[PDB]
Structures are given as structure tokens and as C-alpha cells.
Design a protein around this ligand. Sequence first.
Ligand SMILES: C[As](C)(=O)[O-]
Ligand SMILES: [Ca+2]
Ligand SMILES: [Ca+2]
Ligand SMILES: [Ca+2]
Ligand SMILES: [Zn+2]
Length: 360
Amino acid sequence: ASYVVNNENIDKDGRQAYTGSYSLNDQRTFTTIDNRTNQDEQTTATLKYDGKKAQVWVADQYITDKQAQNIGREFDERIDPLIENNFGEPSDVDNNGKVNILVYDIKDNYDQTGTYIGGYFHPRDLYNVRGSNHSEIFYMDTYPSMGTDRQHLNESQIYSTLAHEYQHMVNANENLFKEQSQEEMDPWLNEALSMASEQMYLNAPLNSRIDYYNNSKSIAYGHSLIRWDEQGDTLSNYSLSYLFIEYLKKQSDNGEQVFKELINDPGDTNTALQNAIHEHVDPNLSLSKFMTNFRIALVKKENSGPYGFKGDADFNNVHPQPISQIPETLAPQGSVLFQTNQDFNVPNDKDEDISYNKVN
Ligand SMILES: C[As](C)(=O)[O-]
Ligand SMILES: [Ca+2]
Ligand SMILES: [Ca+2]
Ligand SMILES: [Ca+2]
Ligand SMILES: [Zn+2]
């Protein structure tokens, strides 16, 4: 027998719950971040593309003009329409109608660890504060994101990351500047939506995120969907966020159109999700139960109903790893798949937020 065990608390900051007893070539200097030390530093870049919606600034001398033009055209022709039609629009704090794409070798510890940063967006750039470039800008890595041969960097490897970062930018605009609350979306769902935009751009599933899900020990032993593990196994959060937003896409009667509704909802993140579920999934289904159903769907993948992804083949290789010993506690929206071949009774002293759901 197997059971999906979930902490149904939707407060990401909630407590541990007990599971029970048993001109071209112009120059500009930008602030960048040395991610080995988190110190600000200065990077001078050259303008290599000046298009309708994007300016491509280059500060890696191995990148050619044609490569920079390819990046700019991809943004103007494909990324910007995708994001504006399905997610939102950027701020324009510098009043120029465009966004900056700074293409350079993001500084990190890849040489020592093999882990690298591909790109990022920093909301401080939208304000008059220390380190700000006072512009819509996102930062795109060259080496090793485009490959490990600096003589043959493949710029098209970064294109889906363009969508990822632009989603962060327009999400920030809506929630920080266009809404009274000026409160960011909860990071787990902001990242989810960035990864949804990557899948839309690629017209293909993010198989590396699924592979990571399938091999993650932290996920198998209860990693939280909503508590973002900044200091620990952050890749597990990326994988859970991605699968959740794809689950919502498949469960929603308006599919990908739900993404912009989540961003533009004036409520907090859980309110936005609850509204989407009530309007597009089931008017009597709570967010907490929808999230439990998500965990069940990863296991069963039923070709119809709440316990799957509507048979979408993009998700057929997802395989939750069962465990034999349930952790003593689970974080909010942390879940495990428990299997036993002996008789099993749900503990009567489990915390009320812990739900046991028999699979098979
Ligand atoms: C790829 As990122 C650092 O914008 O989540
Ligand atoms: Ca601008
Ligand atoms: Ca780099
Ligand atoms: Ca909002
Ligand atoms: Zn992101």
C-alpha cells in the first residue's frame, strides 16, 4: 500500500507539523555583482543591438556583433510578445521604451564547484538605491551558460532564460508598481511562472527539472513546495514550482491564460491561487486540497480528473520516489510518498494539517 502524506498548511512560514506516532558601440558602465563575495562591482559594456524593445549591451569580448544581434532579435521577435501576451509588461523607470539585456560572463564560483549562474533580475535596479542601474535590465551569462568553449559559444542556449528573467521583470512591475499593495508575489510562485514561460517559449517540457525531481532526496523526504530553501537544496524548489504551475495549467479550463490572472490578481499569492482554482478548476475546492491533489497527481497521473495532468505526455516520466519511514515532521506543503507492505493505520495523534491519502 502507498500513501501521499502532505502538510496542508498554506502558510509558507508555518510550523513543523507532526506526522503521528507509530548609437551602436556606445559605452555604458553598469553595476554588476561578484557572486563569489556578493560585492558590487563595475562592468563597462558596449551597445550591440538597439531594437524595438531591447538594447543588448555586451561586456564579454568573445561575443560577436552577430551573436548580440541574434539575441536582440530573438527578444524582439519572440520573447517580448510571448511575455507581454501571457504574463505582463515591464516598468519604464528610465522613460526609454526598452529594456537592457546585459550579456557578459556572470562572475561566480563555477571554476571551483561546477555550479554556475545563468542569469538574473534584481528589483533594486527599478529604484534609486545603492547598486541600482536605474533601468529595466536583466543579466545574462555567457560562460559557461553558452558552452565551455569560449571560441564557440552558442548564444541560442540562453534564449529560454531570456523568457525566465523577463517574466520576473514584468511580475515585479505589476506587483511592485501597478498595485496598491506593492508586495512581491511569493517567490515559489514567481519562479514557477518564470519556468512556465520557458516551457511556452520552448514548446517543450523542462525535462531537466523533471529529472532533478526524480532524483532528489530532499523531495522524497518532504521538501516544501512553498517554503523556498534559499540556503539548501534550492534546485528542489525549482522542480516543485515548475510541476505545480504545469498542474494548474492542465487543471484550469483556460490553461495558459491563468498565468496573467495570477500576476494581475490584486490579492496576495494564496488569494490569487484560490481565486484561479474557484474560477477555472472547481468552485468548492480549497487551495490546500488542490495542493494535496497536486501531490497525488504526480504519483497517479490519471488521464482525467484532479489526480493527474489530463494525460499530457509532457509529464509521464515524473516518478515520485516512495520511502519507508515517514519523517517525524513535515513543513507546510512538504509531502512524502510512503509505502508499506504491512497493515497500516493512520496515526490518531498526527497534527490536523497532516493528511494521509491512500494511492494504491
Ligand atoms: C535563473 As533565476 C536566478 O532568474 O531564478
Ligand atoms: Ca526602460
Ligand atoms: Ca559566468
Ligand atoms: Ca498581483
Ligand atoms: Zn527565476
